[PDB]
Symmetry: D2
Subunit: 403 residues, 4 copies
């Protein structure tokens, strides 16, 4: 399967259609009366001409059909293409990808060094299930600064062997971020004190694969819930892990032991979603930007947690600028008027829906010091922006802002 | 005023969404484009009728008229020039002479060279027919090529907007479907006949179409812009003789003026003529590595074919040459790949030609 | 694709798995770490041994996958195998199969000679849509006797050219039947008076393909709603037409003109249903027999319309005995006590469901001379028996019989 | 008393149906057999524990124990003879000596030669363990081979009945699933861990399994009777040395007596030894035209394989020979084809051997 056409290098959007294409064709007999069906493809122009000599009825009578049933291995290769990674493994869910990854690298006595906050399933996974297997966890709250990461890392090194550094960036809600390259420098030091480099696993669900590539900034694994945004549908549940071949091979071996792979039908559906990923992501992201501009300078908005509007001089702005190529579709704002106004705003929405991709959503993460440190107040509204028309989203936001 | 892309996020439910995208009052779904066409015709025609129609039509539609309807005592009269009211008028008079004109069946733009017909003109010709025979024919417009994003024929005089959704809306080779859109009462008549002859779209396909509609705006826009980029590249290529692409019609021609008033975009499908005849065409085709050799795969992947030796090989030469289908003509149907990959493929294949 | 293994001839149940099997395999690369997946098949034992040399990890590294995506042509060939027909065409529905069939053979001026009663969609198709294209219809009420068929046929020959004889046997409800061979003799005479033999199309939905094969008794086409019983699921809608190759080819040509073919996904689902057809049909039929024995001699049952219990000496019994190999799963009985008792019985059922395959169903066809001639009284209950345990069905029937 | 076949006509809904078929109080669905197994183990074991288990286990389960659980500080002790309480007892004592015995993991009958284990015996050994250590291990029985139709291990002392539904219940190569069945409170613990590690069965597969359950009784019965017919044919065939098929155990053996009390049928999978060693085995395999060469395709199609050179090639020879896996051993997994076609295929392939 080609990554080049002569000297020209193929882009990902092309590759979601072409990479492994030959392996998606089936053959059937040509039987009269001959009609062109929705699936027929021809190896050569002369083959097409011969087929239509039957269709025309000029001649009395093999034909290829292109269907969309890629193996898991081919959908993995396409993911890896999008990421710019060597290799990929698919999983039945985001949580099974994370769990299998942790099971492949940790042992009782170990410490998982991680960022904060993390997806709630990941926190409960570390706090209960891994704690019960003798695995400890130490958090760094501030992932922007190499110094705060270094500190937590000493705290971890004193509880035991650091076998994994687990980060999520940006994290939900409010998009605090971690400096992946700083995490990698700190892993090189950890390794000096202990004789092994921990595996750096980055939950890239929020911005990946289009707007952030953690493997290009020092991560060893880029991990996903493909359920959330890539898949584009609530009935498509999947996770993935991507990185270098030998590291991914170790997760695959664990994946086969514990049986966490993605089933073939879901692989087919994912192959179909990938076809429109670049379109869906780019629209979501442009929609989020237009909405962000509208909320900024809106009388009823206290604060916007939107990374492109961080101050030029801040460390956050500098990091975002070197680690990311876009802001994705998820962000938060604090409304003027606390809870009762936030609820009234929510209750008024007619286009954005209330829940917890594709469709635009609004939620209230609060529903005390922990929540405020994150920037989750009772005035806080989290928006996850889909692919509706931006004008229509903005209209709905204006009127709900009960204004 | 909500945009349709916003509103996309049962047969009955999907029909309602399609009606919203079209801006129509109601919609009926069918197992295929051809079944939508047939069911529509059988709802409206009876032995002794005449179907007046534009030219060229899709080949399945031609067969349907020439064979099946002809056997049921329904004749057909073509107009080759649907741009001018006067040529549409001449045809209608031939048709009135042969029987009751119950349907006017048009297809615009037409595959594979984007011939067009003036839907408002056809409507006026229909209102003359009504004056001269007592009843106004149903105007059905096969809007597959640009619809529903880039043309709304119900806004320009059609009574029904008819689709193969297989081609572009659905997105994939395994999703086949047809639709008929218009006023509840004209549509209701099509559904009754649907119920009788069992031409409904199956539920799973209705579900799959539902899903497809969510990305329809994005995919159509992208295919359209990929197509414009490719047409622009080809227009300057020294192995390309002629383009059949409506945005490139001279701003002063009647075609240009009609395109500007009836359409908001060119869609994904067009043709060009290569230098060096059929043998050059065939070498170009055989060197393609990204565009596949095919007629349709649902609209997501880009395809190339040779209409004179393939789809239009059974069409008489007078029709072919009138619409610009020559031995050097290549049809392209552009999907949503990166435009640079498509252009690089085209450029290397043109070097083989 | 094989119909024989050496000299041994393959049975249909085998063929639903094997016929076109090679065309259902896909190929993928063998990539480490190697695991056996749910889909792998091996061309040879040495190939299997080599694959597991990877799986065992003895060696570091092509493999075939068997999925179930048959072309429509292959599912058609499998149907034809079950029928003992040369050829088959698939359609989007039972009604599209019937309509396409009629459209392929009739023209304004023609008469459709048919049996009675017919499925309601077929009656409305003949009474409205074909009447409006100048096509007339003449019925024979008694399809057992060559004489009553002959009479209607004269009545038809006097209205115009008889191009189709359309029969449904057994018909719903009450399982009146038509003598297909008698219909064929009458078609040979029609042909003598007019110079063409009409096409004999037999709606075989009730007993086909296992318990009746109309093509073996003089029919030219065996036509189906595969929705009702073959498919085994309400979301699987399909029809078919089967017979000799040249006759089926004419229906296919019409099918391509009017676009009434069955879509690929439904073809796949049908391919899956066929795998269990022989099992489902044989259970349904044995269940119906056990239930029939129970209702017969049940105090509260007036009359049973069950073909195996027709009197030995009757023409009906003789016909059934030479035309059918079983009774299928659908029949009727008249309860003692008219409407109010029939309703009470229905309302009491807990296992059989009230509606209009796979699951057992009960309905009231009445809900006056037309209905009685058929043997649809207000006491009449129609049962369509599914694949539940016979003991459980009988239990539910006993108690509902409000007894 | 309703039969389960009657009651088959959300994850939650399908779980309830499976629980009815098993006769269990509750069920949890998983993405695979292996994920059902893993999730169960991780719900119950902690570092310092010992998993006592029967032998042979499925190869994925062996790996899971030998690698993953061993790395998490959980050791494992096997008993080779699960027919006799005394050998199960000896093993349990070895296990108590190494740590807390938290699970007893059994698999009966075992693939590919139908070794069996006495589930009531294991339960008594568990109650002795409880007396000697303070807590009674969870008994999990991998019932894939006969369940749920032909064995109910929860009726004979197991705490949990664990399945690869991929193998026989689901019916097809594209339906992979696992299950854990038992009391609501033991199951509830497995679901909590399921929620945490994300091992749930996807909705579409839950839907597909739903459908499969409707024909489960018919397909299992048919496979079982096809298998009995084939075993009967093979038993008299002059190129067949030995059968590994539980109905053919001597009515006086302990195996026979245990089979009669714990099982209601033999299911579809068994083995036989061919005369002429591996080279004859391989020629037999390569001549098959109806049975395919494979390990599993979901249970509908009949398959043949060579365990010593394929699935059990990594298993040490002492285990292999104890369970009767020899170079001459052929595994058959019988589907729902007509028995005459299968026997005709077997007979012609045996002539090549
Ligand atoms: C949802 C989510 C997960 C877990 O994904 P599932 O597919 O639902 O198991 C992990 N990480 C992040 C950031 C998430 O949003
Ligand atoms: C393909 C096509 C049809 C027929 O649609 P099907 O879905 O293939 O039956 C009708 N009209 C036009 C213009 C087409 O391109
Ligand atoms: C239902 C039925 C039909 C029509 O079938 P559809 O698949 O529902 O279009 C035709 N004949 C008979 C006997 C029927 O029961
Ligand atoms: C296949 C199998 C497993 C594993 O099931 P998967 O669904 O393939 O993960 C477990 N136990 C037994 C006995 C098996 O045969």
């Amino acid at each position: 399967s080609k990554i080049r056409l002569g000297n020209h290098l193929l882009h990902p959007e092309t590759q979601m259609l072409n990479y492994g294409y030959d392996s998606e064709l089936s053959e059937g007999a040509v039987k009269p009366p001959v009609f062109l069906t929705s699936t027929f493809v021809f190896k050569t122009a002369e083959d097409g001409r011969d087929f239509f000599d039957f269709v025309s009825g000029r001649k009395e009578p093999l034909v290829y059909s292109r269907f969309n049933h890629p193996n898991s291995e081919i959908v993995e290769d396409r993911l890896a293409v999008y990421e710019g990674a060597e290799s990929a493994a698919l999983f039945s869910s985001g949580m099974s990808a994370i769990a299998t990854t942790l099971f492949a690298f940790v042992r009782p006595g170990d410490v998982i060094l991680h960022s904060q906050p993390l997806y709630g399933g990941t926190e409960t996974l570390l706090a209960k299930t891994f704690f019960n297997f003798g695995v400890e966890a130490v958090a760094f709250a501030d992932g922007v600064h190499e110094a705060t990461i270094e500190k937590a890392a000493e705290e971890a090194l004193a509880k035991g062997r650091v076998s994994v550094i687990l980060i999520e960036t940006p994290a939900n809600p409010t998009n605090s971020i971690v400096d992946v390259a700083a995490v990698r420098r700190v892993a090189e030091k950890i390794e000096a004190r202990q004789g092994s480099r921990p595996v750096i696993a980055c939950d890239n669900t929020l911005l990946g694969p289009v707007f952030q590539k953690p493997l290009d900034h020092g991560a060893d694994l880029s991990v996903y819930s493909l359920t959330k945004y890539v898949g584009g549908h609530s009935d498509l549940i999947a996770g993935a892990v991507l990185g270098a071949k030998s590291v991914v091979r170790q997760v695959k071996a664990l994946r086969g032991a514990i049986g966490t792979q993605l089933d073939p039908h879901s692989c087919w559906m994912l192959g179909r979603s990938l076809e429109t990923l670049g379109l869906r992501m780019e629209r979501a992201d442009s929609n989020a930007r237009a909405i962000a501009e509208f909320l900024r300078n809106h009388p009823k908005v206290e604060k916007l947690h939107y990374l492109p509007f961080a101050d030029e001089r801040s460390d956050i702005a500098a990091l975002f600028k070197r680690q990311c190529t876009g802001a994705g579709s998820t962000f938060s704002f604090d409304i003027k008027g606390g809870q009762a106004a936030a609820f009234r705003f929510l209750n008024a929405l007619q286009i954005l829906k209330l829940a917890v991709g594709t469709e635009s959503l609004a939620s209230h993460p609060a529903a005390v010091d922990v929540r405020e440190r994150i920037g989750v107040l009772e005035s806080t509204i989290r928006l996850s922006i889909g692919i509706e028309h931006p004008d229509d989203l903005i209209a709905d936001l204006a009127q709900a802002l009960d204004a």
